[PDB]
Amino acid sequence: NGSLRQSLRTLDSFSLAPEDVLKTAIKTVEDYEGDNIDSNGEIKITRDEVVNKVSIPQLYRYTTTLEKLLLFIGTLVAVITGAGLPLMSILQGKVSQAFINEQIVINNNGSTFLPTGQNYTKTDFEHDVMNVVWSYAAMTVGMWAAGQITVTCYLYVAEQMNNRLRREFVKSILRQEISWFDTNHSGTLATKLFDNLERVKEGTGDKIGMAFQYLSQFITGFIVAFTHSWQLTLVMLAVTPIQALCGFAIAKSMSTFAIRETLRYAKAGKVVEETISSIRTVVSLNGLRYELERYSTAVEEAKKAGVLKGLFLGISFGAMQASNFISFALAFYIGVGWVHDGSLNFGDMLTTFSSVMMGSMALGLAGPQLAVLGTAQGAASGIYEVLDRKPVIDSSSKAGRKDMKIKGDITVENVHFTYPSRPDVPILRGMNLRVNAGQTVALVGSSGCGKSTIISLLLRYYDVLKGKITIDGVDVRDINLEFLRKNVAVVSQEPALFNCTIEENISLGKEGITREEMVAACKMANAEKFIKTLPNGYNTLVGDRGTQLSGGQKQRIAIARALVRNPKILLLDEATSALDAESEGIVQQALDKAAKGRTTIIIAHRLSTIRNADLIISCKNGQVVEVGDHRALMAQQGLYYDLVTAQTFTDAVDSAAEGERIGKDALSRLKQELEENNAQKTNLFEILYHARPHALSLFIGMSTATIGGFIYPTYSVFFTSFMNVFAGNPADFLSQGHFWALMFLVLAAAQGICSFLMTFFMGIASESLTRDLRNKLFRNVLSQHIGFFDSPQNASGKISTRLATDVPNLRTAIDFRFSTVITTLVSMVAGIGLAFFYGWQMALLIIAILPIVAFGQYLRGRRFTGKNVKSASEFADSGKIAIEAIENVRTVQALAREDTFYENFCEKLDIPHKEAIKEAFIQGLSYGCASSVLYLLNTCAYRMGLALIITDPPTMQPMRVLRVMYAITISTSTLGFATSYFPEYAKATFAGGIIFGMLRKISKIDSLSLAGEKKKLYGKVIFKNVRFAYPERPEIEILKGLSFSVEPGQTLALVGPSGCGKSTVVALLERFYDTLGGEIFIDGSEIKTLNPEHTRSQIAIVSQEPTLFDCSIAENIIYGLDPSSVTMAQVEEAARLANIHNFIAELPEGFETRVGDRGTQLSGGQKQRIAIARALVRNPKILLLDEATSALDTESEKVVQEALDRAREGRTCIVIAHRLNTVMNADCIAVVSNGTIIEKGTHTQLMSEK
């Protein structure tokens, strides 16, 4: 994707049109932004495609001769359409020469010309102009017909071809061998093949017609250029490499700053991710401001890189626009230096200059079109290989023999077999078994042997590698496959039912099924009972859209489906293996009735149900070991005996004892992220209001974009004035000619500087707003109550990506893309005004036609009416049927319904197809109007222009007529691409609405607050009739009047069942949540009165699983505290009391080793003691212990528990323990049961009562 758009961007770089230079620069920045960039800042490539490509002639096979002719007709007509603009260049030269001449006549009182002395009468001018006017009229009607034929022909053939390609592919894929589906064992194969089926259509449609059109515009565009002046063309083409180098300069800058900016914010992205993920930890350790500082330092670094991006984009885009007009200047300077010599005609100079532009523009338009053909040849291969190109060895559609009437005598003889995939491990090795007509034979054995493969070889899914399998004496390889499948019924372990009604699934059992026939088989399979009990009965849909039936219910319908055709040979492959014990009963009762009256081969997991089989065949390592009924094999003490007794023992022992999901683009997500919240989407003004602090940069940027806007209307004056030089001059073509040619150098310098100042300063305003919103939003998030983080929308990753992509998404509506729209709007107003200033009669006529011209440009964009979402939605329905057939090929191939699924796909394709060819005509008509409306303007402007000169007074002068035309046509050159801002703006309005609303949400329990009582704690913790419920589950109350008191230095212990309320004591005291009744007093003061930040620093926590941050152990211990507060000696002193000094000091680098790097290298016992080290450095007045030991009351438990008691010495403590053993040594203990304490006392005292 990225390698293509990079080469396409160079093709656009060679375009000499001034509006294209703006267009090609805007598109280059898009190439290195969201969705086009990976995680490192690099461009996406190769991943989104096939290695081998199909021939273009081969690609267009399946087209009738009539359509192949339509393809030929449409191609020739396309070359004519492309030859239109170069043909206009000759007409533009002739009419300008005619107009410039009549001016000399008016300047010289109505006479004859200087060259050759031609009396240029009113009729000489009238004949010249009407000749041009009639030509533009001929092209207006002509190019509409030329345009409509090109598109209608190409889209009609593209639809007619792909409609045949779709059905011929499904026709072929269901007839493939099962072995092929083993090699292509991917479940996404069907969906990927249909994704390719669409990509072939995209690159064989009208896009090829367009490719030929832009191809001939490059050729005829330069032919006309070279045949009029081979010198000026070389002069002009010599300046393009300097312009292309500036184009490369944009691509080089935007790519290197995309990598540098993503790497610099990657550091900030890790800060926001690791702290929100464990916010309860960072809040407890009191280091929110430390993190707020790190993220601010990192975002400032990303801003510095972002402002520098605008500087390099400013010089690049500024230079490219400047070198563009230098190409004009240099051509005009040598142009007068050729007309004065008499070597070059003026009209031919106007033609050659216009022709080169049409040619250079064509190159950048051809590239994108040829590329779609390239991906069309690729995607086709995967389809083609399957598509009749490979003759499958197991053809589901052939002729073997049908004459025989089957009794049911099966004979497996010396059958050796190995699956094609994994051909190294054999499965069957000389198996010999016999099944007589009517017998209900059973295959028993271990997992190794292939009892189940016998069924696969009887259905002929795979061929016998050595040996033979015969039905009624005839080898299966000789019998007709379709006939074989119709006579042999299968009931596999996992039943496959298609997305249709119950009776429709059963009907797939027989060709001419009757309702009476179905119920008879449905009652036999014990399914009639539950079907009547559910709504719609048989007419109910069973599948994805319908009701989800039970596994045992689904199997009984499958049993019924196998019975409807009334088979002579029926196979049961562990049909009761994937069912629960309660549901297995009815199914087996149904399998028994189904087996009676025919020959049946049963593969069973439960050997109890295999007891009364007519014959039991035991398999081992792919061969038969014993054959005989239950009585015989049990008397032999063979493999069967071993299996039965072993199983029946396990059965007796058990009976006595017991009896990534979603992925899409930015626009869609931001619509759902606006949802979930109150998020009222923002507008442009609101976003500017937030960018108020950067109003200076924003003002300079928009002011320099307004002055920059006046450059197109003046370029209009600078060009018509250069023409006016040739309008009657006593060899003054040099004095005035070299002046205007050099005036384009001034113009180039004017736009170069204006363009630089625009992108750079709007770059500061946008990147600064990004920084401002980032620091503002993260401070808002860290100051939240923690009940905030319990909400789904406030997930660690959802907030992280909002600061990563959504804030820079808001940026795109304020950077240089927004600035250029202002530039385009100003030129459009100034130009139209300047046009009226020169002549209102001419101006008003042109403007009256412009809405028709714009409408034609609108239709060239391809969008008709509003959207295409409903048109291509009907194609998905046909896909769903075909995908389901490929997902369940084994089932459709066994029921021989592979032919019926093909017809159901075709019938569902008929609706979308009939509408599509109807659409090809409408779409063609649309392009006819699109590619002919430009000639409609010229045929009217020159007709109205002539009528204003041919008048008696006269009303308007020849040159003044042209100054009006070029004032509008040049000033509205940039308007077509100006509409590319609105999709980016709409995307930014969603992002802003979320972010600005997120900032409006203030905390209920404001951390980072400087307000409240900042007191020195002692330890008097008191809970008084405390009632609490979690914010996400407000109704269900966890604490129901918890009351207790803890004195300084005293330790209380909370013990009880799970979900009683003892777990919330550590949270409420650290103020993670507020009480819903009752107060919590800490040293006399109620907890709500205290300043959170100041009291949390005097409280420490050691949890069950303590999380450590990505840093050194030294820094991980003193995480909260500032560097210039605690000495290194205090850290080691804290480590020696926590029993870690030996682990770290006697370890390389000491405490400077990276802990928590890609998981923790240290054990759960080491982490728990580093958590004790954290608590000791900053001597806590109270210390919260919540499930302190996660060492499973074993060896690692005694080492860490002894260290815990060395800490809770001079400080008060509260221990919450799930294990009642480690509770002893506490000054008091309490038992919580329903959110209230029942009994209190000491270990000794509490033990007395029972």
Ligand SMILES: *[C@H]1O[C@H](CO)[C@@H](O[C@@H]2O[C@H](CO)[C@@H](O[C@@H]3O[C@H](CO)[C@@H](O)[C@H](O[C@H]4O[C@H](CO)[C@@H](O)[C@H](O)[C@@H]4O)[C@@H]3O)[C@H](O)[C@H]2NC(C)=O)[C@H](O)[C@H]1NC(C)=O
């Ligand atoms: C190219 O442009 C026009 C074509 O319409 C043409 O203009 C002529 O201008 C003259 C001078 O102003 C006009 O006036 C007179 O026309 C009559 C009838 O044609 C002539 O008889 C006149 O000629 C002379 O007659 C006498 C002969 O000696 C003189 O005494 C007297 O002074 C005149 O000079 C005179 O031209 C005239 O109406 C038009 N021409 C015509 C044919 O009507 C101009 O001449 C053309 N240029 C060239 C080089 O062909």
Ligand SMILES: CCCCCCCCCCCS[C@@H]1O[C@H](CO)[C@@H](O[C@H]2O[C@H](CO)[C@@H](O)[C@H](O)[C@H]2O)[C@H](O)[C@H]1O
């Ligand atoms: C409802 C009647 C509307 C009439 C008002 C017209 C207002 C001025 C023209 C606005 C529409 S023209 C615009 O012109 C662009 C260029 O022709 C179209 O973009 C297409 O062509 C571009 C080439 O410049 C490609 O870059 C772009 O990928 C493609 O979508 C857009 O789809 C198309 O919307």
Ligand SMILES: CCCCCCCCCCCS[C@@H]1O[C@H](CO)[C@@H](O[C@H]2O[C@H](CO)[C@@H](O)[C@H](O)[C@H]2O)[C@H](O)[C@H]1O
């Ligand atoms: C009251 C006020 C009414 C205002 C109405 C404004 C209507 C403006 C219509 C703009 C149509 S888009 C315009 O279409 C023009 C062709 O119709 C484009 O002109 C360029 O491309 C042409 C080839 O299609 C060249 O002939 C032309 O030289 C070039 O400038 C421009 O690049 C492209 O921006």
